Structure 1
Amino acid sequence: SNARFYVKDHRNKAMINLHIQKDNPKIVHAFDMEDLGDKAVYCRCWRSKKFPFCDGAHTKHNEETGDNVGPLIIKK
């Protein structure tokens, strides 16, 4: 292996969110359980066109970057 090709362990510099609500300095969503339906599927990858809800965009992120992120599900 040629070590000159490898980026050694380092403190992350890359953003997670690239586009969503970029005039908001810290994006938080807060929901009351009363308002939720039977199931809500929330995005944790910041790629969904339906953010804060998951639309399956994580599958593209994971395949493209080698990551393993997925949504948070709250069900009733």
Structure 2
Amino acid sequence: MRKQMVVVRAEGGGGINPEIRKNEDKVVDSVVVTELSKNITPYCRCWRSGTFPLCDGSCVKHNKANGDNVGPLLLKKQ
């Protein structure tokens, strides 16, 4: 959408992940659950985190800008 080479990604389209790992056929991440170190580890469901697949709070910025309500998955040891 909007070619200047540079493609400006204007508007919407149907997608939800404009930027992350676009070279991958399908972005899947795996967690072997015994590898968790903290009691609670938040995982990103918004495709905006700078530490994706972890949540860095970018969801907060996305929600306010877009009138959305997404948030992370909390993996808990206990």
Q: Larger radius of gyration, structure 1 or 2?
A: 1
Normalised by the length of structure 1, the TM-score is 0.80
The alignment's C-alpha RMSD in Å is 1.4
Normalised by the length of structure 2, the TM-score is 0.78
Runs of 4+ that moved beyond 6 A: none
Match of 1:30 in 2: 30
AA matched with 2:34: E
- Residues 9-67 of structure 1 show CA distances to partners (whole Å, capped at 9, x for unaligned) of xxxx4210011001001000111111012221000000000000000000111001100
The whole-number CA distance in structure 2 between the counterparts of 1:33 and 1:72 is: 13
Structure (1/2) with the larger strand percentage:
1
Query: Could you list the runs of 5+ residues in structure 2 that have no partner in the other structure?
Result: 1-12
Identity of aligned residues (%): 48
**SS where residue 59 of structure 1 aligns?**
helix
The whole-number CA distance in structure 1 between the counterparts of 2:30 and 2:21 is: 15
Query: Could you list the runs of 5+ residues in structure 1 that have no partner in the other structure?
Result: 1-12
How many residues align structurally? 65
